[PDB]
Amino acid sequence: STECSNLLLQYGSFCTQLKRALTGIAVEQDKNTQEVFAQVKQIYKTPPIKYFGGFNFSQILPDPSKPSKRSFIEDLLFNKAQKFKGLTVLPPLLTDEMIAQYTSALLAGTITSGWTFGAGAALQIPFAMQMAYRFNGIGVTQNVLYENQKLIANQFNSAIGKIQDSLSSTAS
Amino acid sequence: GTGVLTESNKKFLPFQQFGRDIADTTDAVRDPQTLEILDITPCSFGGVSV
Amino acid sequence: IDRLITGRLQSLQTYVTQQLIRAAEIRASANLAATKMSECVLGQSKRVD
Amino acid sequence: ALGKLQDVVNHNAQALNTLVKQLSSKFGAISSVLNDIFSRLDPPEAEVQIDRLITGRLQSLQTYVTQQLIRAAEIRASANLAATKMSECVLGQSKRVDFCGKGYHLMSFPQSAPHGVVFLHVTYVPAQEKNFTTAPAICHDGKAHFPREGVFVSNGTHWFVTQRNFYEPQIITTDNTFVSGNCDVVIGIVNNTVYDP
Amino acid sequence: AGCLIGAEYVNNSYECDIPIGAGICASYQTQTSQSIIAYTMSLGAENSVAYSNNSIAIPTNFTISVTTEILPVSMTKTSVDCTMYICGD
Structure with missing residues (x-):
């Protein structure tokens, strides 16, 4: 329609506002995808030995x-x-591979540090001592954990195993 | 209309001539004096960024 | 053609308004999720529920 | 740094410029001058293009009002968030992580700004870490002892108890431990002796 | 996202300056004339920390830092005329 574009400009400039709004929406979506995952600077890795107390x-x-x-x-x-x-x-800026790498690095840093990698330098600490320190934040002492570590680990493993089964069962 | 003419592997019944898509758009035609299944594709276009 | 282009412009404006309204809630949910992550993963929280 | 404050001003300026420029646009008419239209066209036909013009102007004004409402919603949300952050940071110390800056929240100082507010958060960041040998607990002659507030560390020869925020070696006495059970259930127990004053 | 004409792909990895799409970031950098180059953005450096059964890290010093934050509080006020914006005299 080579003649339809002639009267299109007579109604004013409407393509500029809509394109600007779409660009703003895209920038907002990119910023939202970034501000949730990209929060740490160092990429932590997991050690080869995978014996975290049990x-x-x-x-x-x-x-x-x-x-x-x-x-x-x-x-x-x-x-x-x-x-x-x-x-x-338009394709997103961050890919699924980068998101997975970010999540893996966050999980590794968590497992290795506890609550110090998000506040300063990375400080190593055994997982048993980390759990003993976390148990004190609710009132329970450390002897309860030092006695029932086996039962707590068994219950944690059972819950981790049942989570996947529940997610596979529930389709909604 | 306008577009590129190609050949698709479609089996039309010997009474239909036109062709529609899911979005109510023409996508396949029939050769009038040859009876061959032709496929149309939109002309090339896109956006430019600097 | 004037009525056609007016209807199409109105439809496009309605679509843009709906997209903006949806993106507002999407941004709100994203900010809420980011705050929840920063409060849960990066340390233990004492907030109930 | 003031991009977040200049963005709303630029958006308002652009919206005002667009609303002003939208007037010089024929919405399906022969001209934009109402006086020229009323002078040229007959009174019967004069009630045709003015209808389209007023409809377009009303639509533009409604779009402007809708955009203003959508922007004011987010402005109110941001203002409520800033008020909550101020009330939680300035008057009172908060323990929420990452909320009062990056690090351990100590103090805060508010500042004024045109159509905005500036906060100054003071944090606490440790440095100069050193590796040490740790242990879950120590075993006495016939009982066990657990640290009350601290962690058992060792420099290779002796054992000491320090806090988890500053290296301060102190002797292991009975005023910082408590007896609970014996040395038959903890995995990783070590043999040592405590001091009784 | 398309065909990028006017830049060469470098096998290195730097910080992202101009976002293109799908992890591609362009930057006006020298190859040794300066030209626009194209590369893949990097997520960060490697900071693999050791982990054993009897190791602990206790700090010995501390520092004090002061950060800033900007938050809008309000906007400007507007008021238009009904009979003046629609009709003239």
Whole structure:
């Protein structure tokens, strides 16, 4: 319609405001995706030895066998449209691989530090001592944990195992 | 209309001539004097950023 | 053609308004989730519930 | 640094400029001058283009009002967030992590700004860490002892008890431990002796 | 996202300056004439910390830092005329 564009400019300038609004929405979405994940500067890694006092974390740590580098839980959550007349979809800035790397680094830093990596330098501490210090924040002493560490680890492993089954069962 | 003419592997019944898509748009046609399944595709376009 | 372009502009404006209204709530939810993450993962919290 | 404060001003200026420029636009008419239209066209036909013009102007004004309301919603949300942050930081110390800056919150000082507010958060960041050998607890002749407020550390030869925020070696006495059970349930117990004054 | 004409892809990794899309970041950097280069953004450095059964890290010094934060509180007021913006005289 080579003649339709002539009277289009007679109604004023409306393409500038809508394009500006779409650009602002895209920048806002990028900022929202960033301000949630990109919060730490150092990328922490997990040690080769995976004996954390007796607690199993094989369902949350990334699996190095598959090329996706995602954990067992992230696979179940992940495994669960063309240009019609000009409507185009812009790809995000941060990719799924980068998001997974950020989450793995955060989890590794957490497991290694406790509550000091988010406030200053990284300080190493055993997981048993970390749990003994966390138990004091609610009133329970450390002897209860030093006695029932086995039962607590068994209950934690059972809960971690049942979480995946519940997520696979619930489809809503 | 306008677009690029290609060949699709479609099996139309021998009474239909037009062709529609999910979004109510023409996507497939029929050769009038040859009876061959032709496929149309939109012309190339896009946006430019600096 | 004037009526057609007016209707199309009104539809596009309604779509943009709906997108803005949805993005407002999306930003609110994203800020809430970021605050929850910063309060939960980066240390123990004493806030009930 | 003042980009967050200049953004709203620039948006308001752009909205005002757009609302002013929208007037010089024929909404399907022969001209924009109402006097020229009323002088040229007959009175019967004069009630055709003015309707389109007033409809377009009303639509533009409604769009402007809707945008202003949408912006004021976020402005009110940000103002409430800032008021809550001020009430929680200035008058009273908070223990919420990452809320009062990065680090351990100590104090805060408010400042004024055009259409904004500036906060100055004082934090506490440790440095110069050193590695030490730790242990869950120590075992006495016939009983065990657990640290009350601290952690058992060792420099390689002797054992001491220090806090988790500043290296201060102190002797292990009975005024900083408590007896609970014997040395048969803790994994990693060590043999040592305590001092009784 | 498309075809980038006017920049070469470098196999290095630096900080992101101009966001392009899908992790691609462009920057006007020298290759040794300065030209626009293209590369993949980096998430950070490696800080792998050791972890054993009988190791603890206690700090011995501290520092005091002061940060800042900017938050809008309000906007300007507006008031338009009904009969003057629609009709002239």
